[PDB]
């Protein structure tokens, strides 16, 4: 779908049987989710944004279904105010900016 | 132009005679710059993101030029790690997400 930026670009994701909403975020390198519970091994990693730095759990090779189109990749789990779909997933959706 | 997202989406912008680079950020409501200096009055305002809050200066009705296309509106000035073109400006550049 094409989508304007007059309202926050929120999409519906399915990740590990859980339904969540997340922001399609061209201003993000990675994918970060808060209200979620993934199973298995992970490595700690530190990520930063406009207001500084948070420690998150780095899960590799995770399957997300975002708008019913699928991607696999790194998902991060930690205290992020809003769930974001970053560019590692967005490039998998063949997602572009157009102006 | 259409832009893919394998590289951080950086554009060159002209603001107040100053040339800068800035990320096109669909995950941002506002436009925030660090290394700029604007003239005139401003209101104090606080914004947040990954890591909490930064205190910024709100300048109103500021002309910005990105990819040589013009837009006018609120530009925020404060301690942001990288320059960011938010949705208040992107809607004006008729910028869309396609996926």
């Amino acid at each position: 779908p094409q989508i304007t930026l007059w309202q926050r670009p929120l999409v519906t994701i399915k990740i590990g049987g859980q339904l969540r909403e997340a922001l399609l975020n061209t201003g993000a390198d990675d994918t970060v989710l808060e209200d979620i519970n993934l199973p298995g091994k992970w490595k700690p990693k530190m990520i930063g944004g406009i207001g500084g730095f948070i420690k998150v759990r780095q899960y590799d090779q995770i399957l997300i279904e975002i708008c019913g189109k699928k991607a696999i990749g790194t998902v991060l789990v930690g205290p992020t105010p809003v769930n974001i779909i970053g560019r590692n997933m967005l490039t998998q959706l063949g997602c572009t900016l157009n102006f | 132009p259409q832009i893919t997202l394998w590289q951080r989406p950086l554009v060159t912008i002209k603001i107040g005679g100053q040339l800068r680079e800035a990320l096109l950020n669909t995950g941002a409501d506002d436009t925030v710059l660090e290394d700029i200096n604007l003239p005139g009055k401003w209101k104090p305002k606080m914004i947040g993101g990954i890591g909490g809050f930064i205190k910024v200066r709100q300048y109103d009705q500021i002309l910005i030029e990105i990819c040589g296309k013009k837009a006018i509106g609120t530009v925020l000035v404060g301690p942001t790690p990288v320059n960011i073109i938010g949705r208040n400006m992107l809607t004006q550049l008729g910028c869309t997400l396609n996926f």
Partner: peptide
Amino acid sequence: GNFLQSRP
């Protein structure tokens, strides 16, 4: 509501 995110 400005969610920049890089990893440094």
